[PDB]
Amino acid sequence: MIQCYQCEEFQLNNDCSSPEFIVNCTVNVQDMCQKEVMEQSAGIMYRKSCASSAACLIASAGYQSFCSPGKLNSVCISCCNTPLCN
Numbered sequence: 001m002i003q004c005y006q007c008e009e010f011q012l013n014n015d016c017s018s019p020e021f022i023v024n025c026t027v028n029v030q031d032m033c034q035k036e037v038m039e040q041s042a043g044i045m046y047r048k049s050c051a052s053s054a055a056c057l058i059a060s061a062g063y064q065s066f067c068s069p070g071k072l073n074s075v076c077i078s079c080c081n082t083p084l085c086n
Contacts, residue, residue, distance in 0.1 A: 001026055004033030005086040010045035022084060025050040032056050033085040037067065037076035048086045051079040 034051035
């Protein structure tokens with residue numbers, strides 16, 4: 001019913017867009033998707049994986065959620081309740 005894309009390997013390519021990484025996180029525990037953005041010498045990395053309700057609140061409630069595109073420590077956190085958010 002509701003699935004999400006999980007990507008533990010942060011790479012600077014478009015390979016992280018396959019339907020094989022899409023998992024059906026229907027379990028009460030996790031029912032949302034997690035997305036993160038990072039920037040370093042290597043390039044622009046991004047973390048993704050199945051998130052949960054309680055966790056989703058953490059990021060939101062957690063101040064300093066916003067970020068900037070032109071910042072070395074450009075840390076961004078956010079989740080989604082819709083399927084295939086990433």
